[PDB]
């Protein structure tokens, strides 16, 4: 891209626990606790009672060397800069004697000017990691009162000092791991006359004729002299030039503001994952002198994204704007994919997205207790159209507000609204996850004197009312910014829920059936959740054959929600009889979870314009856990991901039964209008056999981006309290001409009360190298059906779904642990299986 010579410092380097003299082959980047597990110097954090056996170093110090080698040539280089793109969390760094630079803040990436300190030949870093718990133990004594961070698993709360990712600290579906060190790559860059320091490619209109963008550049000249150079940009599309412009400067020593007008004529608009294509531009900015001396560039997405929040008939909107047309947000909010960030690797990302894209999702939360992601995580967003809704930071506790605390802060606010600024899957800032909640409503009011609590809701202000927003409306002007979510609405106050977005922790936490959420709806709800143990491949990776328990303490070590286990009863309770086996109740709990779920993702859909998005609580985990998540830690999709994916399919059949009544509404995510279509539906028992004669309802339209009523029709006078246990409703949508666009199954009763026949599941199968293609046949009905294979991380077309009378179904299962020759052990599961 231009003369610069950048040199990855990711080789060469060693460990050492402080004090000890004793030093070890270390990666970076990387963690401390993975540096020792690599030397068996830890054992397994997430296996069995390993937690509390990892505990000791968060105690210690830890130092990391290296060496490097620099010529006589590239010390003459104009300029040299060392680059840290993440130091957790108070790191001095030294080289060649010289202290470079104290850092204090695992979300900023520092640039250090270093080509006076370096020397020919041999040159020696050295970075000694405080711990973070030690550094802070001062603060806290000082402190006089321990802020309310439940989250933060030590009687000491000295997270909230630290900027540094809440969740290391544990969480309650997370492990305690406050780890150390070099988390993001190092680089050294030789480099002559000047750098860009930033390009930000800033819209400043969009019609489908035009659209205009202001470039915008930051460039930090590093010699004396003044230097006439030449500014170009040029914007291209699939390897084509759309638009080319440059500027004529003389760069001044240290810092240049440069800004370049640029248009693109009918552009070609990104769209979010349902409505087209994810279209990036490609912006490239250069500085030439006499050389191109500096060059960056940026993929970019044209579009507009406006958050519309305003007072109205029903409270307070909470919707997003793309390109001018509301859209219904489908999607889940995202934590930390593991413990220790180095180890998510570039194909456990693109597998997430791959994941997100599958289950029809639009928009992901990056929650707040995590870290602003790896710019990894937002390209990917970017050519996913996956909107991105970004937290900083800060969760569930108030934290301090004094000016070295918010210096550091509005460190990393800059930082990383510069760093994610150019995406186009960027929707929107909020400041914390359920602070203001916290608050308001966790009664923190008893556990402080009443100063000190004026001085959490003044802090409050400070922080999240005036810092936050005042950063993004200079940085990043045009991007919506909230101060909290929930904002307003609690879950236990239903005066608050037309007002903005809620976290209707009603189910689960309030103990509500999984029907309330047919009836507490909000504008948006930004969470929702419901536990599940992970399926027993998971479960087999951290306990042994005699853990198998729900209330072993190997098991109670991997659930962090001390009422976890008696929900997950209570509520299976309701709809499901319980199974006996520890390995039973293991699928149900994941059926349970599924079909609950998905019943409240299918109310919010319903009730659009009402509701504008649902995000559920939580997509992923950071480890071998029971958790509220859809993907379990090694990849596997749990029921809820592909019962997720059904209730949000672009068009989808939704059955609603209340008050002994059955509705059927059609829900459309689609930009166009469907005109002239046949709902068909016909009951049939566990049998096969049709019971009365199919229902047709023709002359149907499907507008885009509604939910409307088709059907109402009672059910006394059509099926006997004996026809409810005994068959079910099928429901298909079709075209004019016959053809299927959508298909739906209803059951009239709970599971439990359901009189499931005894049956067998048959399936024939042709396996190859990577891939496993099944047929599976039931002459009765086969409910809620695990197909389970043993192969961590497999993937199905269809999994958890009810095999339906004599209607064979073809599932392929993908691997690149299947090996043709190998025969893929497969256990099927279905729910008359579970109790005699
Ligand atoms: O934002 C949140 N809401 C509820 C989750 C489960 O208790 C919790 O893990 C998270 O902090
Ligand atoms: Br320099
Ligand atoms: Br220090
Ligand atoms: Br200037
Ligand atoms: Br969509
Ligand atoms: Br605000
Ligand atoms: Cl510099
Ligand atoms: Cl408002
Ligand atoms: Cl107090
Ligand atoms: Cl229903
Ligand atoms: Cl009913
Ligand atoms: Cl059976």
């Known amino acids: ?48 009672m390993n937690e ?159 659209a205009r963008l202001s470039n915008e550049l930051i460039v930090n000249q590093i010699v004396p002299q003044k230097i006439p150079a030449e500014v170009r940009v040029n914007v291209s599309l699939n390897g084509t030039t759309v638009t080319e412009v440059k500027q004529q400067v003389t760069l001044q020593p240290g810092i240049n503001h440069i800004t370049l007008p640029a248009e693109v004529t009918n552009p070609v608009r990104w769209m979010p994952n349902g409505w087209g294509t994810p279209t990036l531009y490609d912006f490239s900015a250069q500085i030439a002198c006499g050389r191109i001396v500096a060059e960056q560039s940026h993929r970019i997405g044209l579009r507009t994204i406006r958050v519309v929040n305003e007072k109205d008939k029903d409270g307070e909107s909470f919707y997003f704007e793309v390109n001018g047309i509301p859209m219904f947000a489908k999607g889940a909010n995202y934590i930390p994919q593991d413990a220790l960030l180095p ?49 900083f930071m800060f969760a569930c506790t108030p934290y301090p507000s004094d000016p070295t605390f918010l210096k550091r802060v509005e460190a990393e606010a800059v930082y990383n609204i510069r760093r994610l600024r150019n995406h186009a899957s960027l929707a929107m800032w909020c400041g914390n996850n359920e602070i203001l909640e916290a608050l308001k409503y966790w009664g923190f009011e008893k556990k402080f ?23 993004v409306k200079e940085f990043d002007s045009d991007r919506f910014y909230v101060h909290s979510s929930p904002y307003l609405a609690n879950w236990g106050r239903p005066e608050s829920w037309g007002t903005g977005d809620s976290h209707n922790w009603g189910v689960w936490y309030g103990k509500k059936p999984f029907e309330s959420l047919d009836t507490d709806l909000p504008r948006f709800m930004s969470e929702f959740g419901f536990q599940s143990f992970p399926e027993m491949k998971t ?28 929900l997950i009863r209570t509520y299976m309770e309701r709809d499901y009889i319980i199974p006996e086996s520890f390995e039973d109740f293991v699928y149900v709990g994941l059926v349970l979870q599924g079909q609950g779920m998905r019943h409240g993702l299918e109310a919010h859909r319903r009730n659009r314009p009402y509701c504008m998005g649902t995000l559920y609580w939580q997509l992923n985990d950071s480890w071998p856990v029971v958790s509220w998540s859809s993907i379990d830690y090694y990849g596997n999709w749990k029921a809820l991901h592909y019962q997720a994916k059904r209730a949000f399919a672009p068009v989808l059949i939704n059955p609603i039964q209340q ?87 209803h059951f009239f009763r709970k599971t439990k009360d359901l009189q499931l026949p005894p049956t067998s599941v048959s399936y024939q199968m042709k396996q190859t190298d990577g891939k496993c293609e099944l047929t599976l046949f039931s002459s009765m009905l086969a409910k809620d059906i695990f197909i389970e294979t043993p192969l961590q991380g497999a993937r199905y077309s269809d999994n958890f779904f009810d095999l339906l009378p004599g209607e064979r179904k073809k599932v392929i299962i993908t691997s690149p642990r299947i090996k043709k020759g190998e025969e893929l052990p497969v256990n099927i599961k279905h729910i008359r299986e579970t109790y005699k």
């Open 52 to 210: 509390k056996k990892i505990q000791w170093v968060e105690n210690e110090d830890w130092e990391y060397r290296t060496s490097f080698i620099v010529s006589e040539e590239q010390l003459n280089r104009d300029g040299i800069q060392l680059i840290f793109e993440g130091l957790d969390t108070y790191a001095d760094v030294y080289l060649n004697g010289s202290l470079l630079l104290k850092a204090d803040n695992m979300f900023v990436g520092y640039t250090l000017p270093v080509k006076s300190v370096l020397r020919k030949g041999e040159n020696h870093l050295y970075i000694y990691f405080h711990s973070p718990i030690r550094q802070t133990l001062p603060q806290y004594a000082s402190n006089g009162f321990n802020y309310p961070a439940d989250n933060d698993h030590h009687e000491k709360h000295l997270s909230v000092f630290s900027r540094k990712a809440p969740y290391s600290y544990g969480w309650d579906w997370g492990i305690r791991m406050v780890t150390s060190g070099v988390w993001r790559p190092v680089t050294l860059r030789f480099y002559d006359i000047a750098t860009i320091s930033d390009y930000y490619v800033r819209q400043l209109s969009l019609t489908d004729e035009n």
């Open 1 to 48: 891209n231009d003369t610069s010579e950048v040199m990855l410092l990711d080789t060469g380097w060693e460990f050492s626990q402080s004090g000890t003299e004793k030093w070890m082959p270390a990666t970076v980047p990387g963690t401390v606790h993975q540096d020792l597990i690599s030397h068996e110097l830890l054992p397994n954090p997430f296996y069995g």
């Open 343 to 391: 180890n998510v690797t570039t194909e456990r990302y693109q597998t997430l997205f791959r994941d997100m894209k599958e289950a029809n999702m639009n928009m992901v939360r990056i929650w707040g207790g995590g870290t602003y992601e790896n710019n990894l995580f937002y390209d990917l967003a970017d050519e996913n159209g996956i909107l991105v809704w970004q937290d």
């Open 659 to 745: 008050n002994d009544s059955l509705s059927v509404y059609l829900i459309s995510d689609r930009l166009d209008t469907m005109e002239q279509m046949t709902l068909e539906m016909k009951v049939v028992d566990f049998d096969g056999k049709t019971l009365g004669k199919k229902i047709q309802v023709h002359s149907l339209e499907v507008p885009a981006n509604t939910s409307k009523c088709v059907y109402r029709a009672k059910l006394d006078g059509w099926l006997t309290p004996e026809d409810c246990r005994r068959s079910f409703l099928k429901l298909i949508l079709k075209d004019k001409s016959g053809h299927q666009v959508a298909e739906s199954v």
């Open 539 to 566: 479960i087999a990776a951290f306990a042994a054959p005699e853990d198998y328990q729900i209330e072993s303490e190997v098991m109670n070590a991997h659930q962090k929600s001390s009422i976890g286990n008696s």
């Open 449 to 471: 004197t009443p100063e000190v609590y004026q001085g959490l809701m003044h802090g409050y202000d400070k922080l999240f009312r005036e810092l936050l927003p005042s950063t």
